[PDB]
Design a protein around this nucleic acid. Structure first.
Length: 367
RNA sequence: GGCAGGUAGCUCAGUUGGUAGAGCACUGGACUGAAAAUCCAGGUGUCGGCGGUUCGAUUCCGCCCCUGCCACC
């Protein structure tokens, strides 16, 4: 119906940006971005009125947000910067060729893909390419972004793009960039399932040393990241109903050997989840003594005592130890399974004495 | 899309999971020609909603509701 409204107003609207990419990648998304030649606000308001849904106009940005069902729609007016602007002018300010395409929702040309810069070819050849060599200089954050994209889609940077990226990092433009944008981009990165590869690309071009203070790369951390890779694989395989955010664990591994001050400050800027901060603060000190206690663990009940109060993240951190791996495994799918019948429980009750008694019964069952 | 706040009618605290609170409106009676003040007391509440784990969830976790702000595709 968007093309109908675009016809009545005599305008031109286009599905734009990564959405189009995700459409060509066979990925369905509930968030759609539009570029409209002429006023986008009136189009969004009319569309929202015809569907009888609340509209959220933003005149200063020239954009409007409206939610239809699960679909989150954002209409934007064509602009030549971050005179009327043609679609091509709006597409030329974008970062990568694969993000620079558009599809027309206008009724006559409906279904046609509009590619000016040959982004379709770069999507075909799995190439991450900038439109202009001045790209990274304008928006330094894109440095991460490209890598992140190169992480997710498993594509490869163009030689021009790569040289421009290396030259961009060498000038230290990553430091001059706003902290919030960078941190946000990293937060976007750690949510990917391929985020490990993104970390590999981060290590190759050494972008993490610039953002984080006092951070350096070594082999132990990397092998720890692959061990964590295997652990994450198995845990997300069998226990998948219990799944949590895995990226923050990698982030903890990277900052493990780093100073505690810069670590807490980093978690402060990144706005890490509570359990992440807790896992880190427990890792910096208590983890050593904990592991040493797990080494002294003989009976299953002492293991139960030294494990159960801890979160899942701590356990996954303990799975890095080869000696403790089969023990934690024994703890997960075996060491905790239990229930009790009626009569017996009723006899157990004949405050805290009840719970302690229960613990005594469990330690009686285990060993 | 991520991070705080959600506790009475309003303004607000509360973590090793273990049987909840302040200050003023609410009912009832002692008090009064009536009313209020004040006294005894006591509702001050499924501590957002729905499930899950647990002997037991305001707390652990998951999906969502609301409000405010930071961030922007």
């Amino acid at each position: 119906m968007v093309g109908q409204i675009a016809k009545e107003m005599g305008l031109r609207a286009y599905i734009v940006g990564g959405v189009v990419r995700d459409i060509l990648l066979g990925k369905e998304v509930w968030d759609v971005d539009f570029v409209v030649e002429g006023n986008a606000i009136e189009l969004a308001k009319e569309l929202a009125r015809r569907h009888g849904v609340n509209v959220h106009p933003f005149p200063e940005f020239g954009t409007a947000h409206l939610k239809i069902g699960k679909l989150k729609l954002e209409f934007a007016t064509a602009r030549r910067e971050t005179e009327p602007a043609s679609l091509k002018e709006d597409l030329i300010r974008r970062d990568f060729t694969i993000n620079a395409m558009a599809i027309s929702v206008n009724l006559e040309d409906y279904g046609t893909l509009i590619d000016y810069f040959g982004g379709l070819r770069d999507l075909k050849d799995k190439v991450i390419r900038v439109l202009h060599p001045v790209s990274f200089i304008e928006d330094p954050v894109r440095i991460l972004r490209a890598l992140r994209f190169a992480g997710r889609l498993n594509f490869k940077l163009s030689r021009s793009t790569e040289k421009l990226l290396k030259q961009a990092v060498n000038l230290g433009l990553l430091k001059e960039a706003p902290r919030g944008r960078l941190i946000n981009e990293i937060k976007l990165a750690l949510r990917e399932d391929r985020f490990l590869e993104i970390l590999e690309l981060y290590r190759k071009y050494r972008v993490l040393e610039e953002i984080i203070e006092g951070f350096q790369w070594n082999e132990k951390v990397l092998q720890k990241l692959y061990a964590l890779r295997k652990v994450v694989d198995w845990h997300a395989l069998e226990f998948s109903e219990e799944r949590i955010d895995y990226g923050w664990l990698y982030l903890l591994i990277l900052i493990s050997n780093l100073d505690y001050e810069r670590g807490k400050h980093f978690l402060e800027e990144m706005s890490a989840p509570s359990w992440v901060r807790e896992t880190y603060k427990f890792m910096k000190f208590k983890l050593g003594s904990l592991k040493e206690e797990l080494k002294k663990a003989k009976e299953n009940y002492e293991v139960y005592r030294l494990l159960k109060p801890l979160h899942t993240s701590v356990l996954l951190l303990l799975m890095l130890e080869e000696e403790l791996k089969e023990k934690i495994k024994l703890y997960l799918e075996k060491l905790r399974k239990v229930k009790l019948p009626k009569e017996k429980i009723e006899e157990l009750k004949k405050g805290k004495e009840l719970g302690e008694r229960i613990e005594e019964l469990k330690r009686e069952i285990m060993n």
